[PDB]
């Protein structure tokens, strides 16, 4: 249910992935010849490039953006196992904030926290441990604390945390794997913050995914009773979790959709969680909306390329 | 085994090497080669049987010269081509000859000299191994010729140098000058079966042997760099990708999947993405990369068949806050524009609905689309403020119907009906003015709403409500009055004229059977009413074709107290549960009607209307729930970011004119440095005028002295506006700050 145009954009090397800001303004790209950029529209429609640079002596995939409560802020993951936090200074100086480099292994997600806890980054790291860092003091940005840590005993390989700003959600991380040896357990494992233990303890396994999740993606909350998940193991597999010390929740999968076959590249669910712009490896990425009777069906395909 | 090659400067021409010769050509569409793309061959060749390689003459004419190695050693050149206009004829059948016979493995032509070519033959105890001819002057006068009792298998010139070439021996792996063929740098490898170098890099060269591939440079040259996997199965093909960077294509015999590798990091690890890809679901032969079209692969089976392919993926998606994501793809990048809620919500925003300090029922008709559900929510709360305002001009309304009727007396049920409202006890009379049965006031007649409903074109309405009032002779009336329009209603004014209320006269029996034959589902509770056996209320009020509100009026009148709470009850728990938005007629705005709300966001994801009618003056005991406080909360954050503030300012005036409970508060306060009612101190001048902090003297905003809230200098409101329109500087010397531009 879309016309499709392409972009008046040229990028040097292939791109990785795209950002987006809030308002709706300026996107993040990437490239496997260490390059970023940030394109700002122009009030008539055209797109214009406005800064670029070189990032680590490897390729940056997991470029991401900030939120304007705090000024403006990137981050990206890269070779040199650190996270690439750079601000803007006002032709705008891009240098700013130092490295976070704390990773003894390869560095696999890089993304922001929801805009009611302050600046929470979080990476997860390769064969272990999952890391956030936290900066109270947002008047230098060079400074951040660790404070916290994990331990997946699996290749990590996406991340994902639920929008949700009400009182009464604990904060929850979804973790994917990425490991596919002959034998099957368990790719994608809830956490949940505490308070008092202070500790992201585990309370869930999503028992019934055995392939090389691609990427998780919760859906934004809006005022609904449950969460929504979003896995691209096989098939779009959305999930649903619902609360009735950990919150045990009663698991009730409502997708599965073989359309892609495939090895699905990565999944996106939109501002008010109601469409799921999916995508995968073969071809045209599909829409999948919603209907009168809860009913998740494709509904819309738009091809690569011109189409 | 077949191979398959591509014509250097043509970009619609390729061969397959077969048992015979054949040259194609790619037709467009709209041999099925594509989905989208079909073959049509042109020419065909046989003279030169046993081939056991091919190689092409990259030259920009003659344009099909073929090179054909042949199990004796003798290499024939021999052209498909075009309509002959021959400018080099003599070349053609100058077949070449070894001076011994062995077989020929390997052929390239050089890429800059563009006519010295490579022959490799196996070994010999008394000759020469690779031989370098020269087709420019039956020519058995090789220009070099090396490796004395050796067998090549492979061979590739270097793009650089001009005349280097590099060859793989038996378990020598040599590259060899030819200016002194004295000397030669080598390694001695078992990966020899195959030799590239990529175009790009053209320092690297991949190598392989048996089932494992090689990875080597031309600047170390000692030992292989990089190493692959022990795939259980031999190779049988590898190839750089001449428009990508970094591809090693791969192939093994007698399967249908193709591997390729990715390879960006060229002291750590090493950067490996592998992803296999099937473009068909037979056995593969041999490929052939492209060397002018976009990433692109034709494959050929066994058999005869031909095919195509393509090669790219790892999109990402980026959302935007107006609906429209953006594509991913290399060197493009697409957008997609446009029901969805959020679409909706847009437009309902922007044309102020939810905001009607006048006929409330205006809403509705404000918001563009018909839908039951919010054609009636409004003419519910219009309803309940109707009588508000009514009883204050002489609150309770609010609770719902189900408070309301708890306490029902009276409540004598009537005998048989004499067919020709006050007598009922005030509660059933306000559930009667909420349905919309009467007006404000205590007109017995139901005649107001009778006649309202003929000016609105509804007939059956106005005939089910009719004589629901008991009246027959009205009930023609309706449908006698209606009949002169549009039309088989006056046919059933007949029949819904008599009924003789027997215990087996023919019109009952009649009756309920040719109810059911009908559409319209008002004339169902028609014949499903008369034929009740005196209490079987079980038809009218469980057809949910029918709208609630009637239902609600219908069973208020008829059933007694013991038979109306079991009713009202048990019907808003399936409307509760079902999350219906008609419940609130008998919720009403009290918990309950918070709980039904939460599964109407919960289906459909509706933050603007369950916002607007919590806000209905509900009392300081629902509106406190943390529950409704956040889909305000939210609605509010989604309207900053479609970038419509005024519309959310307008927002913020409404609630503030009803609940005074959540008022913002001052942020701006006067903090003299020197204690100024202590220190007599007046506040700073503007910078252009220069008059003080105070002094008097539409275009009112220009005198409002602003500040700037770095920099510690501030002044006239107009003042710098028309100052800043020409500079970028703080007015006040000695300071660096761009006041203005340091927002953007
Ligand atoms: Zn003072
Ligand atoms: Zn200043
Ligand atoms: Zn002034
Ligand atoms: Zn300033």
Known sequence: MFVARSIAADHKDLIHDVSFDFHGRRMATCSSDQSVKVWDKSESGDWHCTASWKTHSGSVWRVTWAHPEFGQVLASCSFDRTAAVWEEIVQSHWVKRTTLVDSRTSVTDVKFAPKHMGLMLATCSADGIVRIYEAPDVMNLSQWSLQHEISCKLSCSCISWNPSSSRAHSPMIAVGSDDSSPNAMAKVQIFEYNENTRKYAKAETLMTVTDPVHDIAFAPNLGRSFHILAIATKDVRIFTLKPVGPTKFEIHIVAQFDNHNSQVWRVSWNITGTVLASSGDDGCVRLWKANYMDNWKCTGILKGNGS | ?744
């Open chain 2, 1 to 744: 085994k077949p191979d398959i090659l591509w014509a250097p400067h043509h970009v619609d021409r390729f061969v397959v090497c077969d048992s015979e010769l054949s040259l194609y050509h790619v037709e467009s569409t709209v041999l099925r080669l594509s989905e989208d793309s079909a073959a049509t061959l042109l020419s065909i060749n046989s003279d030169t049987p046993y081939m056991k390689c091919v190689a092409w003459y990259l030259n920009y004419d003659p344009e099909c010269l073929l090179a054909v190695g042949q199990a004796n050693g003798r290499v024939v050149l021999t052209s498909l081509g075009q309509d002959h206009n021959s400018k080099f004829k003599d070349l053609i059948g100058k077949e070449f000859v070894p001076k011994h016979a062995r077989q020929c493995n390997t052929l390239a032509w050089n890429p800059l000299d563009s006519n010295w070519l490579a022959a490799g033959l196996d070994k010999h105890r008394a000759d020469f191994s690779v031989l370098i001819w020269d087709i420019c002057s039956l020519v058995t006068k090789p220009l070099y010729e090396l490796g004395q009792n050796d067998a090549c298998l492979s061979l590739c010139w270097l793009p650089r140098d001009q005349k280097l070439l590099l060859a793989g021996m038996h378990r020598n792996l040599a590259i060899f000058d030819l200016r002194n063929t004295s000397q030669k740098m080598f390694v001695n490898t078992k990966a020899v079966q195959g030799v590239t170098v990529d175009p790009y890099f053209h320092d690297r060269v991949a190598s392989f042997y048996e089932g494992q591939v090689a990875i080597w440079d031309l600047r170390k040259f000692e030992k292989p760099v990089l190493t692959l996997t022990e795939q259980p199965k031999p190779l049988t093909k590898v190839a750089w990708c001449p428009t990508r960077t970094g591809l090693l294509a791969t192939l093994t015999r007698d399967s249908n999947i193709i591997r390729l590798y990715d390879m960006q990091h060229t002291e750590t690890e090493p950067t490996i993405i592998e992803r296999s890809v099937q473009p068909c679901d037979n056995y593969i032969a041999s490929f052939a990369w492209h060397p002018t079209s976009q990433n692109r692969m034709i494959v050929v089976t066994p058999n005869r068949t031909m095919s195509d392919f393509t090669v790219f993926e790892r999109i990402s998606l980026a959302w935007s806050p107006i609906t429209s994501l953006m594509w991913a793809c290399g060197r493009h990048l697409y957008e997609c524009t446009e029901k969805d809620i959020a679409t909706k919500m847009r437009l309902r925003a922007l044309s102020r609905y939810g905001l009607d300090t006048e006929q409330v029922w205006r809403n509705h008709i404000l918001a563009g689309n018909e839908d039951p559900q919010l054609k009636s929510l409004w003419y519910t709360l219009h309803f309940m403020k109707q009588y508000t305002e009514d009883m204050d001009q002489k609150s309770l309304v609010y609770a719902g119907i189900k408070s309301i009727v708890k306490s029902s007396l009276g409540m004598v049920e009537s005998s048989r009906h004499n067919w020709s409202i006050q007598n009922l006890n005030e509660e059933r009379i306000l559930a009667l003015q909420l349905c919309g049965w009467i007006k404000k006031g205590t007109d017995v007649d139901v005649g107001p709403f009778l006649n309202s409903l003929v000016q609105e074109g509804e007939w059956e309405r106005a005939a089910a409500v009719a004589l629901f009032n008991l009246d027959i002779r009205r009930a023609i009336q309706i449908l006698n009055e209606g009949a002169s329009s549009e039309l088989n209603l006056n046919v059933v004014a007949m029949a819904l004229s008599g009924y003789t209320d027997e215990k087996n006269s023919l019109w009952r029996e009649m009756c309920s059977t040719l109810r059911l034959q009908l559409n319209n589902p008002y004339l169902c509770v028609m014949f499903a009413f008369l034929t009740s056996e005196t209490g079987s209320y079980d038809g009218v009020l469980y057809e949910n074709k029918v709208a609630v509100r009637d239902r609600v009026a219908f069973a208020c009148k008829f059933l007694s107290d013991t038979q109306l709470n079991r009713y009202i009850e048990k019907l808003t728990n399936e409307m509760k549960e079902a999350g219906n938005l008609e419940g609130i007629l008998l919720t009403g705005l009290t918990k309950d009607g918070v709980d039904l709300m939460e599964s109407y966001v919960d289906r459909t994801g509706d933050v603007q209307t369950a916002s607007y009618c919590m806000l209905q003056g509900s009392p300081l005991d629902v509106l406190k729930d943390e529950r409704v406080q956040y889909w305000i909360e939210n609605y509010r954050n989604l309207l900053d970011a479609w970038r419509f503030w005024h519309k959310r300012a307008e927002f913020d005036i409404h609630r503030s004119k009803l609940d005074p409970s959540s008022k913002p508060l001052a942020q701006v306060f006067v903090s003299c440095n020197f204690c100024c009612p202590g220190c007599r101190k007046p506040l700073p001048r503007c910078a252009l005028c220069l008059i003080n902090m105070g002094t008097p003297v539409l275009a009112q905003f220009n005198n409002w002295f602003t500040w700037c809230h770095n920099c510690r200098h501030g002044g006239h409101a107009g003042h710098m506006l028309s100052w800043f329109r020409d500079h970028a500087e703080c007015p006040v010397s000695a300071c660096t700050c761009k006041c203005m531009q340091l927002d953007t």
